[PDB]
Design a protein around this ligand. Structure first.
Ligand SMILES: [Cu+2]
Ligand SMILES: [Cu+2]
Lengths: 103, 121, 368, 121, 368, 103
């Protein structure tokens, strides 16, 4: 697909730079959030309930990154190239949804 | 025995419905159709979606969060038939067991099986 | 068994009569007619039983697929199904479609496909899929991907996927208006008219502590939605113009509550419209919310008083009633695959065996 | 009772497997799913195909040729199931009852039902 | 029940381990593996069970459609299925197809369509559809319109409709030659090689009065066909060069036949090639050919002698045996939906419950 | 479809002119038989087991006349226009089969 990059999948350390769609109260905290291109935001299960971050599938290229899950903190980071506004959701509960604006 | 009596968990069968990790399954047990307690039978597809249940372990007496994942892309096994409801909650989501949790596979939306993996405490 | 009236056969045989085989037809939609859907334990293929009360006779059958949702037109004009098929059934290319049958011939008069495999695969509940008042549209719930209400027009075509909030059932108030009611944020009114979708939220009934069952009864003819909790009854009057809440009533007589009484498993509630009576399956339960009940209490919907008793004599999972002047209580046991029919004034009359697999839904037409 | 005992005709039930006419049915009785002893249920299709058995009428003491036609275009009804074999004969044709005689319909080849019409002496 | 060894997990838990879910894989084709198919009483859909004898564990399952024919390559390289589906399953467009699975993963490795819905729908019999000895082909029988033998090539393609005489089974003698034997004009040799179809007929074994059971036993490895009658055994040895008749032997010991002893219903016969034993289902019958039988007599194919006893303890409909050094006798009960496994020298070992509906056919691979 | 004409269906009297084939032992008597275009052909059930006469369906026009049925006597006549050879068969037993040649 296209837009954008992969990296890793569940483990859990930040680093220096923040950047993190997060989780709890079932709902990517600071859900609607903006960020600049060429990036990589970290999602991480803070919950007592696993989750994933699945966009849709007409947005972010072909395919449609699913992303996985796995409490235990666990982390999944995804970086970006092109501009626009992305809309993702947690599969097991299509409800908590989030929307990112790449400016 | 006696359908309307408080769930009584055990830790020695796994093919039986009174098995500890199965406190909120709706469907059938995988071990009965070639899967295993946490693995899907062959030719079947494992979902991402699931539904949780806080089940109590009788040996070491603490509850654990079981993530009931379905194996899909097959027809109901018809084997070890079970329906348990420990803390289920209505369709107004996720603790909810009538829903066929099959999101992830080939396109497998068809219910075959229910897996009972421990995901956390 | 009294179809030992194949004495009519011996009879014809002696008069030197015929045996000229043909495809026959159903008697015609009426109030004593009952539909029984077999979800079958989640099997890829399923069956609908059309039965006659009084007679206790199976009048016909219909074929369906994976976790279909049956609907029956009140005026007795059509019956229908939302369904799902796969090429190499259980696998391959999925197809979601709406089929529409003639109540007499049982033949499909229309077969409308749903575009992106949108249906929502679940154990079935009366009300997650609904016909609107005029019968010209079929409303269906989308969960996966996005919460949504699809709109199909019988004039034969899919119409539009109406976007909604985190909301569940569909209880239509009008041609263009439905209560995509029960949400977390209690009660939604969507008006799909003209061009758009409005969506206006009710004054939150019930608290997060009170749990609403997956199966409420609802009278399309007169906007009566009655929704029992894992214990007792919330009622709302639905018209065009918003919903209006009525004082809550407790189905169980207080002492019963400590003594362990609570509602059952499956289609627990039923409501007779000509009267203002609520039927409720109950028994000495626990967290055994989905299990079978041996009893049924009748209540006056206006005056929450118990008018009735009811020891069913069997382990019943689902109930309903004939929407007519002197009503029958239908009692469905999924385990024994038999439908027990009684007089809504106590006594069991008929019995209908072998509605095989694991039958669960009853639907009747509210006929004049 | 006793599956290996000579078939014993009756002329009083019809939904019963010991009814005179049912001497060589394989499947299900139509009467039991909206049909009739010699008519098909609604939405189902009548085959032209069939298979014969010479059946003994208890009342009038005469044998008749029963033409067992199927009602197709539906899945097995699941009801009054029976399997009779008075004079069946092997697959080397026509007296044989394992075959789904369904030739005639819409294209209906699926077994739903078997009718028991008397087509002659 | 011992799979009560989930004391394996108790162990893992204590050890602080994982629970990392994945799709597993079948143990790998072998001699003790047994396939149980379920025609399920004529249902549009069906199932096939893969079990491990010794363990008694199901290793997998396969889904199929209306009245499909099961095949297993002797080398244990593939297992297959001839099948039929309809859009709107039970009605609509019909599609016949060949399906071939990897014996380890259970994934379809091929899906080949048959041109004009030529299958021939019947309660199944081993041998009315078969693999040729090289396992490059799958022969299947067409009844309606015209009697025919369909040639499918797993190089993935329908090959040709081989027109044949009024003839039924298919016992493959060679890569290009098969005995679509059993005719009223007893036994045809079919050679489909090079360009055409040969079709040569044998010297009529059996008389008009001898009824050959619908379920004959055959060893593809060594062209041994054993065909019981509604009473006793006609044996034939076939190679690419004509069949060759053996002298008849009666399974039932004269006094027994007097005393009403007779052949059961369904997969009545079996033959172990490592030895030259024929197993056969009998009990005291009548015109009740298709009924269950409670016993099995063991006989020597070479010398019609009864080496064996065998009281099953259950109402059994079909049998087969482990084609290995020390064979297990498989006893399938359609009524109880269970497979009773036995020592081919009497004793009952295993049992395998819930092979749901009306399981009827056992198939095994003959492998070194 | 085309080729050729209908007429009746089960009843049983000849007439003057012969032209017929009738049952007996699962087989149409005088099976392969020639006739001129326009000659009638009456099939007559002579059996204690009903039958029909159904060609196939690429032969006789579109469709494919399936013949109905009949026991003890009953009959079906088929008249014909174009020349060629027509193959027909009894469905319930696709086996008794025969061929007509219209010359
Ligand atoms: Cu989530
Ligand atoms: Cu014929």
């Amino acid at each position: 697909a296209t837009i954008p990059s992969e990296s890793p999948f569940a483990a859990a350390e930040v680093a220096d730079g923040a950047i993190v769609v997060d989780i709890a109260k079932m709902k990517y905290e600071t859900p609607e959030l903006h960020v600049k291109v060429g990036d990589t935001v970290t999602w991480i299960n803070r919950e007592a309930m696993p989750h994933n971050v699945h966009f849709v599938a007409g947005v972010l290229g072909e395919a449609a990154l699913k992303g996985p899950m796995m409490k235990k903190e666990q982390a999944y980071s995804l970086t970006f190239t092109e501009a626009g506004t992305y809309d993702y959701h947690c599969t097991p509960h299509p409800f908590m949804r989030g929307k990112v604006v790449v400016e | 025995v006696d359908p309307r009596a408080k769930w009584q968990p055990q830790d020695n069968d796994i093919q039986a419905c009174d098995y500890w990790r199965h406190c909120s399954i709706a469907g059938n047990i995988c071990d009965c159709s070639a899967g295993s307690l946490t693995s899907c039978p062959p030719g079947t597809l494992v979902a991402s979606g699931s539904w949780v249940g806080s089940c109590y372990n009788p040996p070491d007496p603490n509850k654990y969060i079981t993530a009931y994942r379905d194996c899909c892309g097959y027809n109901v096994s018809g084997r070890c038939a079970c329906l348990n409801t420990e803390g289920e909650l209505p369709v107004y989501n996720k603790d909810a067991n009538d829903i066929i949790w099959c999101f992830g596979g080939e396109d497998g939306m068809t219910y075959h099986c229910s897996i009972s993996p421990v995901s956390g405490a | 068994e009294k179809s030992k009236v194949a004495g009519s056969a011996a009879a014809a045989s002696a008069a030197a009569a015929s045996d000229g085989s043909s495809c026959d037809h159903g008697p015609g939609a009426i109030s004593r007619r009952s539909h029984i859907t077999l979800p079958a334990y989640f099997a890829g293929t399923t069956e609908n039983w059309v039965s006659c009360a009084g007679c206790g006779v199976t009048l016909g059958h219909s074929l369906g697929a994976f976790l279909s949702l049956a609907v029956a037109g009140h005026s007795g004009s059509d019956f229908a199904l939302a369904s799902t098929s796969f090429a190499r059934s259980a696998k391959g290319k999925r197809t979601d479609y709406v089929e529409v049958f003639d109540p007499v011939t049982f033949l499909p008069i229309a077969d409308i496909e749903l575009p992106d495999a949108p249906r929502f695969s679940v154990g079935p509940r009366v009300h997650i899929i609904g016909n609107c008042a005029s019968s010209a549209c079929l409303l269906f719930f989308l969960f996966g991907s996005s919460a949504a209400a699809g709109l199909s027009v019988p004039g034969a075509s899919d119409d539009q996927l109406t976007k909604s909030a985190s909301c569940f059932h569909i209880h239509p108030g009008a041609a263009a208006t439905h209560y995509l009611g029960s949400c977390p944020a209690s009660l939604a009114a969507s008006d799909l008219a003209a061009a758009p979708a409005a969506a206006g939220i009710v004054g939150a009934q019930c608290t997060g502590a009170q749990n609403c069952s997956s199966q409420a009864a609802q009278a399309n003819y007169p906007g009566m939605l009655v929704w029992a909790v894992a214990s007792s009854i919330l009622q709302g009057d639905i018209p065009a113009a918003g919903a209006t809440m009525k004082a809550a009533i407790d189905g169980n007589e207080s002492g019963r509550k400590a003594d362990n009484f609570r509602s059952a498993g499956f289609q627990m509630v039923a409501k007779l419209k000509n009267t203002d009576g609520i039927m409720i399956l109950t028994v000495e339960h626990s967290r055994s919310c989905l299990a079978a009940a041996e009893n049924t209490s009748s209540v006056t919907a206006s005056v929450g008083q118990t008018s009735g008793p009811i020891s069913n004599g069997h382990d019943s999972d689902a109930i309903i009633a004939a929407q007519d002047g002197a009503s029958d209580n239908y009692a469905n046991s999924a385990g024994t695959e038999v439908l027990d029919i009684y007089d809504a004034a106590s006594d069991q009359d008929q019995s209908s065996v072998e509605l095989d697999k694991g039958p669960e839904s009853l639907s009747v037409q509210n006929e004049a």
